[PDB]
Coordinates of all heavy atoms in Angstrom, one line a residue:
Chain W
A25 N 190.4 20.5 -20.4 CA 189.9 21.7 -21.1 C 189.1 22.6 -20.2 O 189.3 23.8 -20.2 CB 189.0 21.2 -22.3
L27 N 189.6 22.8 -17.0 CA 190.6 23.4 -16.1 C 191.2 24.7 -16.8 O 191.2 25.8 -16.2 CB 191.7 22.5 -15.7 CG 192.9 23.0 -15.0 CD1 192.5 23.6 -13.7 CD2 193.9 21.9 -14.8
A30 N 188.3 27.5 -17.1 CA 188.0 28.1 -15.8 C 189.1 29.0 -15.3 O 188.9 30.0 -14.6 CB 187.6 27.1 -14.8
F33 N 189.5 32.3 -17.7 CA 188.4 33.2 -17.6 C 187.9 33.4 -16.2 O 186.9 34.1 -16.0 CB 187.3 32.8 -18.6 CG 187.8 32.9 -20.0 CD1 188.1 31.7 -20.7 CD2 187.8 34.1 -20.7 CE1 188.5 31.8 -22.0 CE2 188.2 34.1 -22.0 CZ 188.5 33.0 -22.6
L35 N 186.3 31.3 -14.0 CA 185.0 30.8 -13.7 C 184.9 30.1 -12.4 O 185.9 29.6 -11.8 CB 184.6 29.8 -14.8 CG 184.8 30.3 -16.3 CD1 184.4 29.3 -17.3 CD2 184.1 31.6 -16.5
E40 N 179.0 26.9 -15.4 CA 179.1 28.1 -16.3 C 179.6 27.6 -17.7 O 179.0 28.0 -18.7 CB 180.0 29.1 -15.7 CG 179.4 30.0 -14.6 CD 180.4 30.6 -13.7 OE1 181.6 30.6 -14.0 OE2 179.9 31.0 -12.6
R43 N 176.7 25.9 -19.3 CA 175.8 26.8 -19.8 C 176.2 27.4 -21.2 O 175.4 27.4 -22.1 CB 175.6 27.9 -18.8 CG 174.7 29.1 -19.2 CD 174.4 30.0 -18.1 NE 175.6 30.6 -17.5 CZ 175.7 31.3 -16.4 NH1 174.6 31.5 -15.7 NH2 176.9 31.8 -16.0
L59 N 171.8 25.5 -43.0 CA 172.7 25.3 -44.1 C 172.3 24.1 -44.9 O 172.6 24.0 -46.1 CB 174.2 25.0 -43.6 CG 175.1 26.2 -43.4 CD1 176.4 25.8 -42.9 CD2 175.2 27.1 -44.6
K90 N 180.2 37.3 -42.0 CA 178.7 37.3 -41.9 C 178.2 36.2 -42.7 O 177.4 36.4 -43.7 CB 178.1 38.6 -42.2 CG 178.3 39.7 -41.1 CD 177.7 41.0 -41.6 CE 177.7 42.0 -40.4 NZ 177.3 43.4 -40.9
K91 N 178.5 34.9 -42.4 CA 178.0 33.8 -43.1 C 177.7 32.7 -42.1 O 178.4 32.6 -41.0 CB 178.9 33.3 -44.2 CG 179.1 34.3 -45.3 CD 180.2 33.8 -46.3 CE 179.7 32.8 -47.3 NZ 178.7 33.4 -48.2
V95 N 179.5 30.8 -38.7 CA 178.8 30.4 -37.5 C 179.1 29.0 -37.0 O 179.2 28.8 -35.8 CB 177.3 30.6 -37.7 CG1 176.5 30.1 -36.5 CG2 176.9 32.1 -38.0
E101 N 185.3 29.9 -26.3 CA 186.1 31.0 -25.9 C 185.6 32.3 -26.5 O 185.8 33.4 -25.9 CB 187.6 30.8 -26.3 CG 188.2 29.5 -25.7 CD 188.0 28.2 -26.5 OE1 186.9 28.2 -27.2 OE2 188.8 27.3 -26.5
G116 N 191.7 47.1 -18.7 CA 192.7 47.6 -17.8 C 192.1 48.2 -16.5 O 192.8 48.8 -15.7
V121 N 191.4 38.5 -13.8 CA 190.0 38.2 -14.0 C 189.3 38.0 -12.7 O 188.1 38.3 -12.6 CB 189.9 36.9 -14.8 CG1 190.6 37.0 -16.2 CG2 190.5 35.7 -14.1
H123 N 190.2 39.8 -9.8 CA 189.9 41.1 -9.4 C 188.8 41.7 -10.2 O 188.0 42.5 -9.6 CB 191.2 42.0 -9.6 CG 191.1 43.4 -9.1 ND1 191.9 44.4 -9.6 CD2 190.3 43.9 -8.2 CE1 191.6 45.5 -9.0 NE2 190.6 45.3 -8.1
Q130 N 181.0 43.9 -6.5 CA 181.0 44.9 -5.5 C 180.5 46.2 -6.0 O 180.7 47.2 -5.3 CB 182.4 45.0 -4.9 CG 182.8 43.8 -4.0 CD 184.2 43.9 -3.5 OE1 185.0 44.8 -3.9 NE2 184.6 42.9 -2.7
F145 N 177.3 38.9 -17.5 CA 176.8 39.9 -18.5 C 177.6 39.9 -19.8 O 178.8 39.9 -19.8 CB 176.8 41.3 -17.8 CG 176.4 42.5 -18.6 CD1 175.1 43.0 -18.6 CD2 177.3 43.1 -19.5 CE1 174.7 44.1 -19.3 CE2 177.0 44.2 -20.2 CZ 175.7 44.7 -20.2
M146 N 176.9 39.9 -20.9 CA 177.5 39.8 -22.2 C 177.5 41.2 -22.8 O 176.5 41.8 -23.1 CB 176.6 38.8 -23.1 CG 176.8 37.4 -22.7 SD 178.5 36.7 -23.1 CE 178.4 36.8 -24.9
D156 N 183.0 51.6 -17.4 CA 183.7 52.5 -16.5 C 183.4 52.2 -15.1 O 182.7 51.3 -14.8 CB 183.3 54.0 -16.9 CG 184.2 55.0 -16.4 OD1 185.3 54.7 -15.9 OD2 183.8 56.2 -16.4
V171 N 185.9 51.5 5.1 CA 187.2 51.1 5.7 C 188.1 52.4 5.7 O 188.8 52.7 6.7 CB 187.9 50.0 4.9 CG1 189.4 49.8 5.3 CG2 187.1 48.7 5.2
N175 N 189.5 54.3 9.0 CA 190.9 54.5 9.3 C 191.2 56.0 9.4 O 192.0 56.4 10.3 CB 191.7 53.9 8.2 CG 191.5 52.4 8.1 OD1 190.8 51.8 8.9 ND2 192.1 51.8 7.1

Side-chain angles (χ1 to χ4, degrees):
Chain W
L27 173 59
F33 296 100
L35 311 179
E40 280 155 20
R43 172 173 60 188
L59 274 183
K90 281 177 177 175
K91 298 174 78 70
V95 174
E101 301 86 332
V121 302
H123 185 204
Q130 289 176 355
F145 175 98
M146 284 291 291
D156 193 14
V171 168
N175 299 354

